[PDB]
Amino acid sequence: ESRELMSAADVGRTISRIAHQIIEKTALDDPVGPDAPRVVLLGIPTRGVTLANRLAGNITEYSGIHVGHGALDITLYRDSTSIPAGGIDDALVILVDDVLYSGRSVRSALDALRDVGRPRAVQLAVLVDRGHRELPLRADYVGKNVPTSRSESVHVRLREHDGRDGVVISR
Amino acid sequence: ESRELMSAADVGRTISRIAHQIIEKTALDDPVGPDAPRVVLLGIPTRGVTLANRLAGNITEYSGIHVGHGALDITLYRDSTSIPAGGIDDALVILVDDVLYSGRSVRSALDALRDVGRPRAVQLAVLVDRGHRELPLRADYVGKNVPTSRSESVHVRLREHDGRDGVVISR
Amino acid sequence: ESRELMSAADVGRTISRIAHQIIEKTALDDPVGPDAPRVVLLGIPTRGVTLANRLAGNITEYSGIHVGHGALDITLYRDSTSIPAGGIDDALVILVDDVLYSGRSVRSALDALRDVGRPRAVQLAVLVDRGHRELPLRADYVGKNVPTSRSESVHVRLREHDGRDGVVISR
Amino acid sequence: ESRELMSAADVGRTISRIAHQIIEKTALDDPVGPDAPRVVLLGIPTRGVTLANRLAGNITEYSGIHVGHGALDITLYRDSTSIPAGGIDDALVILVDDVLYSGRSVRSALDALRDVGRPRAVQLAVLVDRGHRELPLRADYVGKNVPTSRSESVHVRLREHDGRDGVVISR
Amino acid sequence: ESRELMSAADVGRTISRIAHQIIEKTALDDPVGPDAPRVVLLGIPTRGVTLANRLAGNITEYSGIHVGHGALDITLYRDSTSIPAGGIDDALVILVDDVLYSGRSVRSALDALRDVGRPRAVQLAVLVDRGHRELPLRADYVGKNVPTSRSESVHVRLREHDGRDGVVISR
Amino acid sequence: ESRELMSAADVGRTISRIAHQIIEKTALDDPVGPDAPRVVLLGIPTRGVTLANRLAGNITEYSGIHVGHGALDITLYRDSTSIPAGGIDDALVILVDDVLYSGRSVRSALDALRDVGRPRAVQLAVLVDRGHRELPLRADYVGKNVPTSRSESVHVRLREHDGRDGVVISR
Ligand SMILES: O=c1[nH]cc(F)c(=O)[nH]1
Ligand SMILES: O=c1[nH]cc(F)c(=O)[nH]1
Ligand SMILES: O=c1[nH]cc(F)c(=O)[nH]1
């Protein structure tokens, strides 16, 4: 059994709001001072990459600033990577995924990240937080908090990846 | 120069509340069973270890449950560990520290923790969150959120370690 | 399904009786002379440790004597150890577990013990003997002899560990 | 001061009774089945070997079944081995010694035994238990329980080994 | 022969005095800082470790301060080590032994200690100074100065080790 | 700024007293022997060497005995050496320095010494002890104990090294 949690319009509005939170919180709009570092969005393959790419698109549309974005493979970090020109050294890296659950993927991403470089800081953006974290990891940007039973599943859908925008829950 | 954020009485009341939050959230009080894992408090040296010991004491006094507690040395995980007998495999491990700052100490603790065993989940408790995180790490239990400038310093004082309970800020 | 072998009151009366047997059999309350060894309780994780801790407490209450007690990790002795101050050399060590079955856990304890020191003697106390030994090992103190089939399971519950006292058998 | 605890006739009656206990308890004359494994008697050198050999003779005389028997050297297991064809894997091994005292020799046999194979279970048979065990080890078959002071000695004599059957105590 | 230098009551009163000297001299009661460093007691195996543990208990009882305490093996430093979590860097380490003689054991401890970390300072506490030093090493805390000949031996007894507290001299 | 702690006459009187203490304590003028080892003074470069040399002269003047004396370089022993004919094996070695402070130089000397030979024993003589030791090292001969703040400096002057005898303190 399945049900719609977010419509295509819902996801659009939320992704847009997330993009503006990012702009607000990083001030990427400003002349990048000493204490205001360049932003890089790295998505967790593969739908996380889709989300990071769209966020990058939105931010460019709203601010005129082109933020670097890529992908961070975590296959070899569980108990192809693509980094923008300029790397991540002393940058603000925003890890991006579609769903935050136990948090174990994000920890893998943190591990993977240090084989790449040394960011000034790392943030996390997700479309959905479905709870039941198993590590003290939290998203800095959350599209929607979706309370779930352990037996339920949350399914994020993005146009470029799955054919439609939407979020569905099933049991 | 210097000023008091928490009195000894403040620290006492706050620690007692955290202990009850832990009891509430883990339900260590009711008969264990399949769905309630044993809880282990691991402190980050040294005041985190002090705080962990006090929390364990408080928890036993309020619930009658003896929680395992120890210390997690993180020296070889930056830039001797003490785990209660029976280990931490499939336990709910709560990392304990006095101050949450950048979060890098907590990350080191997670790394050290992974060379020790495989917990069911890991939570984090701190007396003070002074902001300025550089990782997407957040405490599940927080004594007090203390806004600070980077130039300021937070000094937690615990009786078993410093002769008195209290939290002071300096510049 | 499930059935009760011992009520909480049962467990209390029995643990108290065991405590007094130990005191009687070791004469630990008498003025320790040259030829009368100090008693050390080492529990096998985890409920054996709970049981060892409670017994030590009981012994102090009934005799005023504080016996050293700790835990003996046997994980690397099958397929962190905690030894009280003064160690176990020339001591009378009482291994404590909740259930005696095949006896292999106890034999592992004997192996683990031999990497710790050389006691004068080793005894064994258990809450329940459910039979079916596969080694010539027997307990010196037994809470209750419970005949069981190979298909049954024995579940000991102790207050400090599980919130309640009791022993149940299931099939 | 010397004194006789058991006459030759005593030893004879007692060894014969043990043989029948073994036959009864292992049902070795019945068809070897899942819960009825082949029996192997291994004596501890050297008089234990004599006793194991006698028991095998008696068992054959009473049941017509020839049980495998040999010796288990424990020299390299303290603080020449001879195994019957078919080994001891999944067998019921009965360790045999003349006197059970501290229990340390038997523990050595247990250690020595696992460098030989994996028995289904291990039992222990001794002619005399003189008490004062220093380990939680007990014999499954005991010829005679002989109370002794720490200063007394128990001496087993078997004909094939010493020239007579008998048991003597000295101080 | 043998003779008593200190009674159990003597040892208790003296150990208590040492504990207060340590508290006074380190100002352990005051907040850990530059002029009051964190204290760690490291005992020399084996009775030195027990004594360190006893001192820690006393200090806790008198001051409420829980001092780290452990053991420093000096086997590999002549002609099992246990360090509390957080190590000894910039700590005040107090080496503890039962008897100071030639001073060679203490020097080995000093060597072993720098393979562990870099303390702010190192002090020494002993129950007995038996004279005859062969190095310019002296204890900062001394229980009793006992004049002895080269042919005499001093035997310290601690309850957790020997059942009683006491100091005897023999020839 | 500065003030005089010891006049040239003071230093002369003190150095003379130290020489006689050495003679008294080592009995170097007596017919040597098994339990009376030859004395060797080794100074720490450079003013310590001057003091050792002056002491040797005094001892010779007062006793007629010529003690071997030299220098012990400690440059390679932190964080030209000259050893008298006959070496230091089984000798009584007296390390000599002008000022004893933290004691870290003296420990280096003990380390430097083990690369030279094996003395029967090692003593230490200094003109001034200004306190603030960071190790359990003490001088066996002390010219003068000078209480000082950590912010002060102690300056020893010897004629052969600096043109005059004296001790001055500055802040
Ligand atoms: O049902 C799903 N399968 C795989 C996915 F990645 C997802 O989001 N949802
Ligand atoms: O007196 C004895 N000597 C040797 C033995 F093996 C024994 O059992 N008794
Ligand atoms: O300035 C100084 N030079 C050399 C010294 F030995 C001293 O004490 N002070």
Side-chain angles (χ1 to χ4, degrees):
Chain A
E1 60 182 345
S2 70
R3 177 178 72 261
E4 190 188 55
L5 286 180
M6 300 178 69
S7 70
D10 288 339
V11 174
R13 287 182 279 264
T14 291
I15 289 184
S16 181
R17 179 268 294 174
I18 290 172
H20 281 267
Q21 277 176 324
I22 291 171
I23 290 170
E24 174 191 23
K25 188 178 172 181
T26 66
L28 57 77
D29 242 351
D30 288 348
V32 53
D35 192 65
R38 67 195 170 97
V39 180
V40 181
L41 310 187
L42 300 177
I44 297 181
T46 53
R47 191 177 292 102
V49 165
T50 311
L51 184 57
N53 181 77
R54 190 180 298 185
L55 282 171
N58 281 230
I59 295 172
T60 290
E61 171 187 350
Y62 306 149
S63 69
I65 290 63
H66 292 69
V67 301
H69 60 281
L72 184 59
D73 190 81
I74 61 167
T75 311
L76 305 176
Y77 294 92
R78 295 180 181 172
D79 306 318
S80 67
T81 289
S82 177
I83 313 297
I88 62 172
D89 285 333
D90 202 51
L92 171 61
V93 173
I94 304 181
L95 296 174
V96 183
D97 212 343
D98 58 343
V99 179
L100 180 55
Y101 191 3
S102 77
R104 295 190 183 286
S105 290
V106 163
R107 175 185 190 171
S108 297
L110 291 178
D111 286 340
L113 199 51
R114 53 187 177 185
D115 286 338
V116 172
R118 301 180 181 277
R120 185 181 300 181
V122 183
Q123 296 176 357
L124 172 63
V126 299
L127 189 66
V128 179
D129 188 342
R130 65 163 292 184
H132 305 274
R133 65 184 172 272
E134 291 167 12
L135 296 167
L137 294 169
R138 309 299 286 146
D140 301 281
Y141 316 87
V142 175
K144 191 190 208 68
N145 290 286
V146 175
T148 61
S149 78
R150 187 171 176 79
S151 63
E152 285 179 318
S153 298
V154 173
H155 310 288
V156 172
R157 303 281 111 104
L158 295 174
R159 190 184 68 252
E160 310 93 324
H161 189 282
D162 308 288
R164 73 175 71 107
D165 277 355
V167 180
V168 170
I169 192 178
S170 67
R171 184 180 62 199
Chain B
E1 292 308 321
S2 178
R3 59 190 172 279
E4 190 188 55
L5 283 47
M6 300 178 68
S7 70
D10 291 340
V11 172
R13 280 181 270 95
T14 292
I15 290 184
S16 181
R17 179 266 293 174
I18 291 171
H20 281 89
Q21 276 178 325
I22 288 171
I23 293 169
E24 173 191 23
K25 187 178 171 60
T26 67
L28 58 77
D29 210 338
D30 63 18
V32 173
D35 190 64
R38 76 192 179 291
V39 178
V40 180
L41 311 186
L42 299 178
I44 303 180
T46 52
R47 289 192 181 85
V49 170
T50 309
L51 183 57
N53 289 332
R54 188 180 298 186
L55 283 173
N58 283 49
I59 291 172
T60 291
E61 172 185 349
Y62 306 149
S63 70
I65 296 298
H66 291 68
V67 301
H69 60 100
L72 186 59
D73 191 282
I74 62 167
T75 309
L76 305 177
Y77 292 97
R78 296 179 181 172
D79 306 317
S80 174
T81 290
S82 175
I83 313 297
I88 56 81
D89 286 334
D90 201 50
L92 176 247
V93 172
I94 306 179
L95 297 175
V96 186
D97 212 344
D98 59 342
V99 178
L100 183 56
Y101 196 4
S102 78
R104 294 190 182 285
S105 290
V106 163
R107 175 184 191 170
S108 297
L110 292 179
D111 285 341
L113 203 241
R114 184 170 51 195
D115 287 337
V116 169
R118 301 179 72 84
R120 187 181 300 181
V122 187
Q123 296 175 357
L124 173 63
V126 300
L127 188 67
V128 172
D129 190 342
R130 66 167 293 183
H132 306 274
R133 66 182 172 272
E134 293 167 14
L135 298 168
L137 295 169
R138 311 304 288 145
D140 301 280
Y141 315 94
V142 174
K144 194 190 212 311
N145 290 103
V146 176
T148 65
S149 78
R150 298 284 295 175
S151 63
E152 286 178 318
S153 299
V154 173
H155 308 287
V156 174
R157 306 281 185 59
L158 298 175
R159 182 177 59 249
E160 307 91 324
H161 188 91
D162 304 287
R164 70 191 70 186
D165 278 356
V167 178
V168 303
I169 192 178
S170 65
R171 183 181 61 199
Chain C
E1 297 306 320
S2 300
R3 175 175 70 86
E4 193 187 56
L5 283 9
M6 301 178 68
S7 71
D10 289 339
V11 173
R13 289 182 281 263
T14 292
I15 292 183
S16 181
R17 179 267 293 174
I18 291 171
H20 281 267
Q21 274 178 323
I22 292 171
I23 294 168
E24 173 191 23
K25 188 178 171 182
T26 69
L28 56 77
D29 53 351
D30 283 349
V32 53
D35 192 65
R38 72 194 178 290
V39 178
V40 177
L41 311 187
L42 299 178
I44 302 180
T46 52
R47 287 193 179 85
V49 170
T50 312
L51 183 57
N53 289 332
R54 189 185 298 188
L55 283 172
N58 281 232
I59 291 172
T60 291
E61 172 187 350
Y62 308 150
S63 71
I65 303 298
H66 293 69
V67 301
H69 61 102
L72 186 60
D73 189 2
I74 65 166
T75 309
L76 305 176
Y77 290 107
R78 296 178 181 171
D79 307 317
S80 174
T81 290
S82 175
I83 312 298
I88 63 172
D89 288 334
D90 200 38
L92 176 243
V93 172
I94 304 179
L95 297 175
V96 184
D97 211 344
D98 58 343
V99 180
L100 182 55
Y101 194 4
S102 77
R104 295 190 182 286
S105 290
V106 162
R107 181 237 189 109
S108 297
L110 294 179
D111 287 341
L113 197 50
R114 185 168 51 196
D115 287 339
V116 170
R118 300 181 71 84
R120 187 182 300 181
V122 183
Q123 295 175 356
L124 172 63
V126 300
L127 188 65
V128 177
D129 186 341
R130 66 166 293 182
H132 305 274
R133 66 181 173 272
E134 293 168 14
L135 297 167
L137 295 170
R138 310 306 290 145
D140 300 281
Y141 314 91
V142 175
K144 194 189 211 311
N145 290 102
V146 178
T148 65
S149 78
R150 298 283 293 172
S151 63
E152 286 179 319
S153 298
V154 174
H155 309 288
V156 171
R157 301 282 185 259
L158 298 176
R159 182 179 61 251
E160 307 92 325
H161 188 280
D162 304 286
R164 70 183 171 194
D165 277 353
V167 181
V168 301
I169 190 179
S170 66
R171 184 183 294 276
Chain D
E1 294 307 321
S2 177
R3 173 173 67 87
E4 190 187 54
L5 287 180
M6 300 179 69
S7 72
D10 289 339
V11 170
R13 289 181 281 264
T14 292
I15 292 184
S16 181
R17 180 266 294 173
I18 293 171
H20 281 90
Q21 278 177 325
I22 289 171
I23 293 169
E24 173 191 24
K25 185 178 169 59
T26 66
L28 56 76
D29 53 353
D30 286 349
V32 173
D35 191 65
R38 66 194 169 95
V39 182
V40 177
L41 313 187
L42 300 178
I44 301 180
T46 186
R47 191 177 292 102
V49 166
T50 309
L51 182 56
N53 184 253
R54 278 264 201 107
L55 284 171
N58 280 230
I59 293 172
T60 291
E61 172 186 350
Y62 305 150
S63 71
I65 300 298
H66 292 69
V67 302
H69 62 282
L72 185 60
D73 193 279
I74 61 167
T75 311
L76 307 175
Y77 294 94
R78 298 180 182 283
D79 307 318
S80 66
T81 293
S82 177
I83 311 297
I88 61 172
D89 288 334
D90 199 38
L92 169 62
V93 172
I94 304 180
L95 297 174
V96 186
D97 212 344
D98 58 343
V99 177
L100 181 55
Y101 192 4
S102 78
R104 295 190 183 285
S105 290
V106 159
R107 177 235 229 293
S108 297
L110 291 178
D111 287 342
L113 200 51
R114 54 186 177 185
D115 287 338
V116 170
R118 297 180 179 276
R120 185 181 299 180
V122 187
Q123 295 175 357
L124 172 63
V126 300
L127 189 66
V128 176
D129 189 342
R130 66 164 293 183
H132 305 272
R133 67 183 174 272
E134 292 168 13
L135 297 167
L137 294 169
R138 310 303 289 146
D140 302 281
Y141 313 93
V142 176
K144 190 190 206 67
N145 291 287
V146 175
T148 62
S149 78
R150 298 285 294 171
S151 64
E152 284 178 317
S153 298
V154 175
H155 309 288
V156 175
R157 303 281 109 103
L158 296 175
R159 182 177 60 251
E160 308 91 321
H161 187 94
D162 306 285
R164 73 176 70 107
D165 277 354
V167 179
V168 170
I169 200 277
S170 66
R171 183 177 60 88
Chain E
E1 61 180 345
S2 301
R3 176 173 70 89
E4 191 187 55
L5 287 180
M6 299 177 68
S7 70
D10 288 338
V11 174
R13 282 180 269 96
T14 291
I15 291 183
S16 181
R17 178 266 292 174
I18 295 172
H20 280 89
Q21 276 176 324
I22 289 171
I23 291 169
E24 175 192 24
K25 187 178 171 60
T26 68
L28 274 185
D29 252 17
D30 288 348
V32 174
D35 290 72
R38 156 182 54 117
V39 177
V40 179
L41 310 185
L42 300 179
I44 299 181
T46 181
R47 287 192 177 85
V49 167
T50 309
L51 182 56
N53 185 76
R54 187 81 70 81
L55 282 171
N58 282 25
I59 293 173
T60 292
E61 171 186 350
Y62 306 146
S63 70
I65 296 297
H66 291 69
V67 300
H69 62 283
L72 186 60
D73 191 4
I74 59 167
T75 310
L76 305 176
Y77 292 88
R78 298 181 182 174
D79 306 316
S80 304
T81 292
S82 176
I83 312 297
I88 58 172
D89 288 334
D90 200 50
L92 171 60
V93 170
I94 301 179
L95 297 175
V96 186
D97 211 343
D98 57 341
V99 177
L100 180 54
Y101 194 6
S102 77
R104 295 190 181 285
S105 290
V106 163
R107 175 184 190 171
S108 297
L110 292 178
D111 285 340
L113 201 173
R114 54 185 176 186
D115 287 339
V116 169
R118 299 182 71 85
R120 185 182 299 180
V122 186
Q123 296 175 357
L124 170 62
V126 303
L127 187 66
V128 176
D129 188 340
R130 172 241 230 279
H132 305 272
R133 67 181 173 271
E134 292 168 13
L135 297 167
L137 295 167
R138 310 304 289 145
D140 304 282
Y141 314 98
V142 174
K144 190 190 209 68
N145 290 287
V146 178
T148 61
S149 78
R150 297 282 293 172
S151 62
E152 284 179 317
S153 299
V154 175
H155 309 288
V156 174
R157 301 282 184 260
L158 299 176
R159 69 170 69 103
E160 307 92 324
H161 243 93
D162 306 286
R164 72 179 70 187
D165 279 354
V167 178
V168 169
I169 194 178
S170 66
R171 183 182 295 276
Chain F
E1 291 305 321
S2 69
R3 68 185 179 279
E4 190 186 54
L5 284 46
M6 300 178 69
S7 69
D10 288 340
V11 172
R13 286 183 278 264
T14 294
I15 290 184
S16 181
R17 180 268 293 174
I18 294 171
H20 281 267
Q21 276 178 324
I22 289 171
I23 296 169
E24 173 192 23
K25 189 177 172 60
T26 69
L28 57 77
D29 54 351
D30 282 348
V32 220
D35 192 64
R38 72 191 176 289
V39 180
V40 180
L41 312 186
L42 300 178
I44 299 180
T46 52
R47 191 175 291 101
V49 169
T50 313
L51 182 56
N53 185 76
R54 187 98 126 255
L55 283 172
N58 280 231
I59 293 172
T60 289
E61 172 186 350
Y62 306 152
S63 70
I65 301 298
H66 292 69
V67 301
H69 61 281
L72 185 59
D73 191 86
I74 60 167
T75 311
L76 305 175
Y77 294 91
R78 299 178 182 172
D79 304 317
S80 302
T81 287
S82 293
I83 312 298
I88 61 172
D89 287 333
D90 200 50
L92 175 285
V93 172
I94 306 179
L95 297 174
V96 185
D97 212 344
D98 59 343
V99 180
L100 181 55
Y101 194 5
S102 77
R104 294 191 181 286
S105 290
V106 162
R107 174 185 190 171
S108 298
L110 292 177
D111 286 342
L113 260 189
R114 58 186 179 186
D115 288 337
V116 168
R118 298 182 70 84
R120 187 181 301 181
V122 189
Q123 295 175 356
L124 171 63
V126 301
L127 188 66
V128 178
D129 189 342
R130 65 165 292 183
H132 305 273
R133 67 181 173 272
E134 293 166 13
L135 297 169
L137 294 169
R138 311 303 288 145
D140 302 281
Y141 314 92
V142 174
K144 191 191 208 311
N145 290 286
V146 176
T148 61
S149 143
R150 184 169 174 77
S151 62
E152 284 179 318
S153 298
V154 173
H155 311 288
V156 173
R157 303 282 112 104
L158 297 173
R159 72 172 68 100
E160 309 92 323
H161 189 281
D162 308 288
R164 69 184 170 195
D165 278 355
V167 181
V168 301
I169 194 178
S170 66
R171 183 180 61 197

